[PDB]
Amino acid sequence: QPNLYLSANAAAVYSVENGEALYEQNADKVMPIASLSKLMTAFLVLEAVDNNELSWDEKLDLVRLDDPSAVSLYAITQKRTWSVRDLYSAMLTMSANDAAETLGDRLDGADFPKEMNNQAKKLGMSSKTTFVSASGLDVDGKSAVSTTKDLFLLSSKLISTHPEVLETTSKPTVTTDKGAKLESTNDLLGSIQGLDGLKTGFTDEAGYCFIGTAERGGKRVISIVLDAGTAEKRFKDTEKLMEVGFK
Ligand SMILES: *C(=O)[C@@H](NC(=O)/C(=N/OC)c1ccco1)[C@@H]1NC(C(=O)O)=C(C)CS1
Secondary structure, three states: OOOOOOOEEEEEEEOOOOOOEEEEEEEOOOEOHHHHHHHHHHHHHHHHHOOOOOOOEEEEOOOOOOOOOOOOOOHHHHHOOEEEHHHHHHHHHHHOHHHHHHHHHHHHHHHHHHHHHHHHHHHHOOOOOOOOOOOOOOOOEEEOOOHHHHHHHHHHHHHHHOOOHHHHHHOOOOOOOOOOOOEEEOOOOOOOOOOOEEEEEEEEEEEEEEEEEEEOOEEEEEEEEEEEOOOOOOHHHHHHHHHHHOO
16 A cells, blocks of 8 residues: 555545455544544434435424534524424534534434444444444543444445435535525535545544545545544545545
8 A cells, every 4th residue: 555644643545346445544443533423413314314204394493512612503593493404414514513413313312322323333333433422522421433444334335325415515515495504614625526525523532534535437435534633634634545546
């Protein structure tokens, strides 16, 4: 494998076709993942719509977060009622934590972390993965953790099961029906040709994290960057991983 000099502590890029690694650094090491948890929440929201168990047009009131300081749709808008569609978009574009928690609570109430971990097992993720909340916020001091290998398995399963997820994560801005603008945290959209996802994350413990995905000519790759040093460097790391991915 090539000799990359990444900011990330743990990183890898995989070809979706055979699931095989084109670069791996610390790909078995258990890492905090933070807002990357929202990809499991998206999967379960998309499953519930397909199962005739949830409506895109259902109106829900945002749940209140124990810390009013965290990134939240409510603080940006002063608007409490939102459709499932817009909460889903907010979760994936700007990483609104209260959107993610409102969706998880609607799906399974208090038991939603159990459902995330049940589904982690069904998707082939190892027992090193632990989800604690729909948003990736710590609960009872407990943090969501995984590995780049398990994160790949979740990502590729999300994309092959619900390809329409990329219709949301490929957009630099999502405008809801009523005109609210939801700006994506993925600053590489429009910079790498073929890049259409997937999810950012950051906490002090997790560092700056990003799962990316791009397809050129039938070939899809998924890159995972964990614990980069700055908000810009997880993207510079991704640029290097995409270059290896399409070599
Ligand atoms: C997901 O990781 C989420 N992070 C936080 O809400 C958060 N938690 O700290 C305990 C935090 C602290 C400082 C900034 O966020 C979203 N992560 C990011 C990002 O990927 O950079 C943004 C832009 C929205 S919050």
